[PDB]
Amino acid sequence: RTCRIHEISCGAHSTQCIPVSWRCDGENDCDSGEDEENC
């Protein structure tokens, strides 16, 4: 957790940062596909 301001985290066990813009854009980007949960 606590990644760069530009990028949000999408896991608890894993470290894999993604840009904020990737969040809720209709396609998965994380193994725990929580980028598309609670849109």
Partner 1 sequence: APTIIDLTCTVATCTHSSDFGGVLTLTYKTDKNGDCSVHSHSNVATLQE
Three-state secondary structure readout of the chain: CCCCCCEEECCCCCCCEEEHHHCCCCCCCCCCCHHHCCC
Asked whether position 14 contacts a second copy by CB under 8 A, the answer is: no
- Contacts (CB under 5 A) with Ca ion, residues 19-38: 22, 25, 27, 29, 35
What whole-number distance in Å separates Cα of residue 8 and Cα of residue 21?
A: 9
- The site map against partner 1 for 1-39 (x = CB under 8 A) is ------x--------xxxx-x------------------
Applying CB under 5 A, the residues found at the interface with Ca ion are 22, 25, 27, 29, 35
